[PDB]
């Protein structure tokens, strides 16, 4: 190979407020013309010691590659330790100015930001997703070697090295830290295997925080546990269970056949359907209104509304809000999940769809779906980059129905027997708990706040809590409350649980 390629400066990644998240750091790459190195053998041990390498093992490497015009001695050294080797003044030893990524918030935004490979190319998260934007264009310089490898003339610059472009993520580091800390605390308190937590701006489609457990320090390029590198929020599919009942309810209110004050008889708390039996955990109910179906998380109640309205209307809401659908984010091997579909829905499939057993979604899809519900039935496109001009948004649920489902969800949190642990002191919060049997469990809470003018949608997913209580309303709901209280105050969202008398 004739001429050498000048490495380009990788674009700076910031959070939405300009806080540096991934920074291109100058590293020194040392290489050698082994033809020339062979003429300074007395120098070789010093060189070997200055590179941590074994004296004899290093001499073997050079002797082997003695014919070559180029070989790499060592990549990624600090410029100052690169200086130290250059300070030896060993003939046939040359250097390349290179770039390596430094991630100032480390493990805190590991999954969202991602990391680069040995060649400084995006390998995970944003780094991989916006690789072309961030990479820029490498340089080219005309070198004149006599024959061996003497740096003679550089007559022309050939082609200038183009730097990569800056990217400001939709992430707020302040909210990222709180979500990070609280998710880590939840895991240790519950002895859980994993977890995810997504925060979103219902008005802009911006992902304000996305955290997962386990995490890793992307500045520590050794050990690298692939399980700790998994961006679970985007790559781990799960059965959403009861967190999908607000969408089945939206289909009910939209059909013209149901109103919140209507009653469903759920007695004896079981419902037999051919070969399968739908079951509720608490089976001390007869008549329940639609809000009561949500408060008690009645599978029987929601399956009965489903049979009346038809599964097709339920499927449609779920599909339109983006459950089991492409996010448009175009992230590294991001999972799409599965929303089952039929021409003729059998009774057993209609019920399971209505209560979330028949389906695979990601934490990001669930949050986005709750975002459209919170934003008065308008789905705004998801973004991982700061949104200055907000795109049009799509009315996926009528405002009236969305507003009604919001009120019911507020009552899920605030009513007697409700998910009190989800209460956000100073504000009116809304949401719905979920618990999915995988015995192994997954604990879920999805919600939004402030009910008066929803601003934030949040999903808390805790995988395999090993403590006595495994229910979403018990394991996830306190995390929602904790993160919500802080995120809203960090955004200076004024408190809404204000007087009226």
Ligand X SMILES: *C(=O)[C@@H](NC(=O)/C(=N\OC(C)(C)C(=O)O)c1csc(N)n1)[C@@H](CNC(=O)c1cc(-c2cc(=O)c(O)cn2O)no1)NS(=O)(=O)O
Task: Supply the residues annotated as catalytic.
Answer: 242
The residue range among 27-35, 115-123, 294-302, 328-336 that interacts with ligand X, by the rule CB under 6 A, is 294-302
DSSP result, 307-328: HHH-HHHHHHHHHHTTTTS--S
Residue nearer to ligand X on the CB measure, 282 or 403: 282
Q: Which of 235, 433, 465, 482 binds ligand X (CB under 6 A)?
A: 433
Residue nearer to ligand X on the CB measure, 116 or 242: 242
The residue range among 6-14, 400-408, 435-443, 460-468 that interacts with ligand X, by the rule CB under 6 A, is 435-443
Residues 6+ apart with CB under 8 A from 500: none
Q: Identify residues 357-416 at the interface with ligand X (CB under 6 A).
A: 357
> What span, in angstroms and rounded, lies between the C-alpha atoms of 32 and 86?
11
Residue nearer to ligand X on the CB measure, 58 or 357: 357
- Among 435, 446, 452, 453, which Cα is nearest to 484's? 446
434 near ligand X (CB under 6 A) = yes
- 328 phi-psi bin (left φ>0, alpha ψ -120 to 50, beta other): left
Compute the least distance from the CB of residue 13 to ligand X, in Å: 37
The token pair at 96 is 């390349």
Entry field: residues in the chain: 501
237-276 footprint of ligand X as x/- string (CB under 6 A): --x-xx----------------------------------
Ranked by CB distance to ligand X, the top (closest) residue is 242
Residue nearer to ligand X on the CB measure, 14 or 298: 298
436 near ligand X (CB under 6 A) = yes
Q: What letter does residue 383 receive in the DSSP assignment?
A: B
- Among 388, 495, 494, 490, which Cα is nearest to 174's? 490
Compute the least distance from the CB of residue 64 to ligand X, in Å: 59
Compute the least distance from the CB of residue 455 to ligand X, in Å: 24
Residue nearer to ligand X on the CB measure, 16 or 432: 432
Is there a cis peptide before residue 394, judged by omega within 30 degrees of 0? no
Residue nearer to ligand X on the CB measure, 82 or 240: 240
Residues 6+ apart with CB under 8 A from 468: none
For ligand X, how many residues bind (rule: CB under 6 A)?
20
Compute the least distance from the CB of residue 412 to ligand X, in Å: 10
421 near ligand X (CB under 6 A) = no
- Among 327, 353, 350, 328, which Cα is nearest to 339's? 353
324-363 footprint of ligand X as x/- string (CB under 6 A): --------------------------------xx------
Q: Identify residues 447-486 at the interface with ligand X (CB under 6 A).
A: 471-473
Kindly report the backbone phi and psi dihedral angles of residue 271, in degrees, each rounded to the nearest multiple of 5, phi listed first.
Answer: -150, 115
Tell me how many degrees the CA angle 212-218-219 measures, rounded to the nearest 5. 150
Number of C-alpha atoms within 13 angstroms, CB side, residue 9?
A: 11
303 near ligand X (CB under 6 A) = no
DSSP result, 236-263: --B--GGGGHHHHHHHHHHHTS--TT-E
Residue nearer to ligand X on the CB measure, 205 or 473: 473
Compute the least distance from the CB of residue 296 to ligand X, in Å: 6
Residue nearer to ligand X on the CB measure, 356 or 454: 356
Compute the least distance from the CB of residue 462 to ligand X, in Å: 12
The token pair at 267 is 């007695």
170 near ligand X (CB under 6 A) = no
Q: Which of 64, 166, 282, 338 binds ligand X (CB under 6 A)?
A: 282
Residues 6+ apart with CB under 8 A from 501: none
Burial of residue 154 (CB within 10 Å: 0-12, 13-18, 19+) is exposed
Q: Identify residues 23-52 at the interface with ligand X (CB under 6 A).
A: none
Residue nearer to ligand X on the CB measure, 24 or 435: 435
The residue range among 148-156, 254-262, 336-344, 433-441 that interacts with ligand X, by the rule CB under 6 A, is 433-441
The CA-atom distances, in angstroms, between 255 and each of 251, 353, 355 are 6, 17, 18
Instruction: Give SS3 for 272.
Output: strand
Compute the least distance from the CB of residue 492 to ligand X, in Å: 32
Compute the least distance from the CB of residue 419 to ligand X, in Å: 8
Q: Which of 437, 466, 467, 494 binds ligand X (CB under 6 A)?
A: 437
> What span, in angstroms and rounded, lies between the C-alpha atoms of 446 and 243?
7
Q: Are 393 and 321 in contact (CB under 8 A)?
A: no
Q: Are 32 and 71 in contact (CB under 8 A)?
A: yes
Q: Which residues bind ligand X (CB under 6 A)?
A: 239, 241-242, 281-282, 296-297, 299, 356-357, 417, 433-437, 441, 471-473
């Amino acid at each position: 190979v004739r001429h050498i390629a000048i490495p380009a400066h990788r674009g700076l990644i910031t959070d939405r407020n300009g806080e540096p998240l991934a920074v291109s750091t100058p590293v020194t790459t040392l290489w050698a013309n082994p033809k020339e190195l062979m003429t300074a053998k007395e120098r070789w041990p010093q060189l070997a010691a200055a590179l941590g390498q074994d004296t004899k093992l290093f001499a073997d490497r050079i002797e082997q590659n003695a014919e070559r015009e180029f070989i790499y001695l060592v990549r990624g050294l600090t410029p100052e330790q690169g200086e130290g080797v250059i300070a030896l003044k060993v003939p046939g030893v040359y250097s390349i100015e290179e770039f390596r990524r430094f991630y100032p918030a480390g493990e805190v935004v590991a999954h969202a930001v991602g990391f680069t490979d040995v060649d400084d190319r995006g390998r995970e998260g944003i780094e991989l997703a916006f690789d072309e934007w961030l990479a820029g264009v490498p340089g080219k310089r005309q070198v004149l070697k006599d024959r061996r490898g003497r740096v003679i003339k550089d007559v022309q610059v050939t082609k200038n090295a183009k730097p990569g472009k800056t990217l400001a993520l939709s992430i707020d580091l302040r909210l990222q830290y709180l979500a990070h800390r609280e998710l880590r605390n939840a895991l240790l308190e519950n002895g859980a295997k994993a977890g995810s937590l997504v925060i979103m701006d219902v008005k802009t489609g911006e992902i304000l925080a996305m955290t997962n457990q386990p995490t890793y320090n992307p500045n520590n390029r050794r050990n690298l546990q692939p399980a700790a590198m998994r961006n679970r929020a985007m790559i781990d599919v799960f059965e959403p269970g009861s967190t999908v009942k607000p969408f089945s309810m939206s289909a009910a209110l939209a059909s013209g056949r149901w109103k919140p004050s209507d009653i469903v008889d759920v007695y004896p708390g079981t419902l037999q359907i051919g070969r399968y039996t739908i079951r509720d955990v608490s089976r001390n109910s007869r008549q329940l209104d639609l809000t009561g179906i949500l408060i008690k998380s009645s599978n029987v109640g929601i399956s009965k509304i489903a049979f009346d309205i038809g599964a097709e209307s339920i499927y449609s809401v779920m599909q339109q809000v983006g459950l089991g659908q492409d996010t448009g984010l175009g992230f590294p091997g991001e999972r799409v999940g599965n929303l089952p579909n039929h021409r003729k829905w059998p009774k057993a499939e209609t019920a399971t769809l209505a209560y979330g057993y028949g389906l695979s979604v990601t934490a990001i899809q669930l949050a986005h779906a709750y975002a459209a519900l919170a934003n008065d039935g308008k789905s705004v496109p998801l973004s991982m980059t700061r949104v200055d001009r907000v795109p049009d948004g799509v009315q996926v649920i009528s405002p009236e129905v969305a507003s009604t489902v919001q009120g019911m969800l507020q009552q899920v949190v605030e009513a007697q027997g409700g998910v009190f642990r989800a209460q956000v002191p100073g504000y009116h919060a809304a949401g719905k708990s979920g618990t999915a049997r995988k015995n192994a469990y997954r604990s879920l809470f999805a919600g939004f706040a402030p009910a008066t003018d929803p601003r934030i949608a949040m999903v808390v997913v805790i995988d395999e809590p090993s403590k006595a209580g495994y229910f979403g309303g018990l394991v996830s709901a306190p995390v929602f409350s904790k993160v919500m209280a802080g995120a809203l105050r960090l955004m200076n969202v004024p408190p809404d649980n204000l007087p009226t008398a």
